[PDB]
Amino acid sequence: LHTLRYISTAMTDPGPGQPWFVDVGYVDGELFTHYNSTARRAVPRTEWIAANTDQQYWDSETQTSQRSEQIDRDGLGILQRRYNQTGGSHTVQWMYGCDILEDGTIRGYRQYAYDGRDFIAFDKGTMTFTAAVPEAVPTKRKWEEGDYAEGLKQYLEETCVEWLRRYVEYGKAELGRRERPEVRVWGKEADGILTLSCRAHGFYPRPIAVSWLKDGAVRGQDAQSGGIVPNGDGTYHTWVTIDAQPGDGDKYQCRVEHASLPQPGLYSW
């Protein structure tokens, strides 16, 4: 129902002129805050968070991010040594946050990956840290002897949830909106095969069902989907194709089921 997620990436090789540390936060999947090691300021990324926060809020967020940056700066060297690596391209990622589910239960998580693979994760229910690899056991041991679980549990169950509920209210008009897609069916024939495409442009919220129908009946044989991909403006896009016989285009319809459409939409080429 609602989610607050913060993530960060620390890179040894971000590329020329690119920041090596990037931290971003999301409410209900929408980017609302950003920090990196070049600008070194945590900033708002939606109008609804900007309108409902003050300078002290962003000074505090910046302080937190700068601390995270110095910890992960050293973390890059620490794990290279843990894995007996010399230099090269390496990354440290973490993600943490809280979910408010539809019945009202709360979930919280904090997990890490090294070079894109699971490294360690909080097990809040036992107040331990779950090592995913032998290399994470020294980290697990230090965090468990150091009683970091207490403050992490408090953040995930109290602070995270309390602020998520505020963010959802601040952004209620934007997060709760519905935007109707613009749908185009197109066809291309090659190698004796008619490939029909159906693209839904600009829908919000993200969940959608796009299906191909033949003579009224649903068809998935030789159908392919590109999944849901983002637009620059917070809306979404998806395409689905199906292969047909040349001359059979009139028998196909694209069906779009979306929260913005009280009745599903049917589209012809």
């Binding site: 913060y6 931290d23 936060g25 945590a42 809020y57 505090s60 967020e61 302080q63 937190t64 991010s65 601390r67 995270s68 910890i71 050293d74 973390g75 620490i78 794990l79 843990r82 440290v92 943490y96 904090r110 890490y112 980290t139 230090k142 965090w143 970091y148 403050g151 992490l152 953040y155 602070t159 995270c160 602020w163």
Partner: peptide, 9 residues
């Protein structure tokens, strides 16, 4: 808000 913590790897 972000979690200000001092968990080092």
């Amino acid at each position: 808000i972000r979690h200000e913590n001092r968990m080092v790897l």
